[PDB]
Amino acid sequence: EFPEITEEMEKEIKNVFRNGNQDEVLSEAFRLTITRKDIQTLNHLNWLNDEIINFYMNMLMERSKEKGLPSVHAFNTFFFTKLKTAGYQAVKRWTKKVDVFSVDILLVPIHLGVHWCLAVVDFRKKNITYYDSMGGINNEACRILLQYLKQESIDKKRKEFDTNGWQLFSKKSQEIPQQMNGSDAGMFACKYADCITKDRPINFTQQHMPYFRKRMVWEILHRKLL
Amino acid sequence: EYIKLKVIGQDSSEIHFKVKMTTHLKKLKESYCQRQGVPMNSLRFLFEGQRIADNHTPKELGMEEEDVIEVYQEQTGGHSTVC
């Protein structure tokens, strides 16, 4: 649905957008912290930072535990850059105590210096899908993730990853809602992932973004997805 | 006391610490950044991928002699350009 932002929700949101101790912790979970600085990046058309994104991705993961939802494992936003610049060896230990082959969906948020995109591995559909709210193609990211799956299977499960039936693609500009400002890339990334982890068609547009920013502030403060 | 760690910046530079196994890593982080001349909130301390909270301890994280703490900076983004 697009549940309404209530009066008290507004009162609470406007409240944390205010001036205050920039480092003050406003929400805590997953042994992570979200400060007033972090919340501000959701304000106006500010650029989302890694703390907001990773935190949200972790909420998606929490939600994914319920019946009728695909299970999810979300890498943090430093993962892909580190895999790309150094190799598998530099990230292999990031998944001791997680079996990536035992969930339905891997979320890979991707930071490109000044922009955010999302890669998703879906083991049900057997494909590695890249999503850019500015319509860029990044099949090299997908390839890198395939190669990652091969190596992670050898290292954690001592068998070769079955490559048969896998598709690596980038969503085309006209298949997913695009951004139209210079700021909302983080928001598209998060909301793309929200729909995907609910198994529902992407049903929003740039028009919903100021609503989504304000709402996200709230969902983060109360550590509940609406 | 019980272990020596390497805190390695993403520019490849190292600062060595000797730390107690049951002590919170908050002071370690605040030392590092203070030493670097940067504010705390600009930095992110990972141990093999796991974000290190102010109340995390070496024991909790299963760290061993000579283990590595990686420092990452904040990532921000909004759009892509021309190239």
Q: Work out how many domains chain A is built from and give that number.
A: 1
Query: What does the alpha-carbon distance between residue B34 and residue B23 come to, in Å, rounded to a whole number?
Result: 19
Distance from CA of B18 to the nearest CA of A (A): 23
Query: What does the alpha-carbon distance between residue A42 and residue A210 come to, in Å, rounded to a whole number?
Result: 9
Domain interval for residue A138? 1-226
Contact between A116 and A130 (Cβ < 8 Å): no
> Does an H or E element contain A40, and which?
helix A36-40
Residues 6+ positions from B60 with CB-CB distance below 8 Å = none
Query: What does the alpha-carbon distance between residue A133 and residue A179 come to, in Å, rounded to a whole number?
Result: 6
Distance from CA of A163 to the nearest CA of B (A): 26
Rg of the Cα atoms in chain A: 18
Amino acid, res. B45: F
CATH at residue A19? 3.40.395.10
Of A49, A94, A181, the CB nearest to B74: A49
Backbone angles phi, psi at A167, to 5 degrees: -115, 130
- In 3D, which of B50, B60, B2, B54 has the Cα closest to residue B25? B54
Of B48, B75, B78, the CB nearest to A94: B48
Q: Which domains does chain B have, with CATH numbers?
A: 1-83 (3.10.20.90)
Q: How was this structure obtained?
A: X-ray
> Does an H or E element contain A27, and which?
strand A25-29
Backbone angles phi, psi at B22, to 5 degrees: -105, 5
How many other CB atoms are there within 10 angstroms of residue A148's CB atom? Answer: 25
B74 to chain A, any CB pair closer than 8 A? The answer is: yes
Query: What does the alpha-carbon distance between residue A160 and residue A59 come to, in Å, rounded to a whole number?
Result: 32
- In 3D, which of A132, A125, A120, A221 has the Cα closest to residue A185? A132
The token pair at A206 is 């740039």
Distance from CA of A9 to the nearest CA of B (A): 26
Query: Can you count the helices (H) and strands (E) in chain A?
Result: 7, 7
How many other CB atoms are there within 10 angstroms of residue B28's CB atom? Answer: 21
Inter-CA distances, A204 with A57, A72, A136, Å: 19, 22, 19
Cβ-Cβ contacts under 8 Å, B51 against chain A: 31-32, 54, 76
B46 to chain A, any CB pair closer than 8 A? The answer is: yes
Could B80 and A134 be called an inter-chain contact, meaning their C-beta atoms sit closer than 8 Å? yes
A186 to chain B, any CB pair closer than 8 A? The answer is: yes
Cβ-Cβ contacts under 8 Å, B78 against chain A: 45, 47-48, 114-116, 181-186
- In 3D, which of A162, A38, A57 has the Cα closest to residue A108? A57
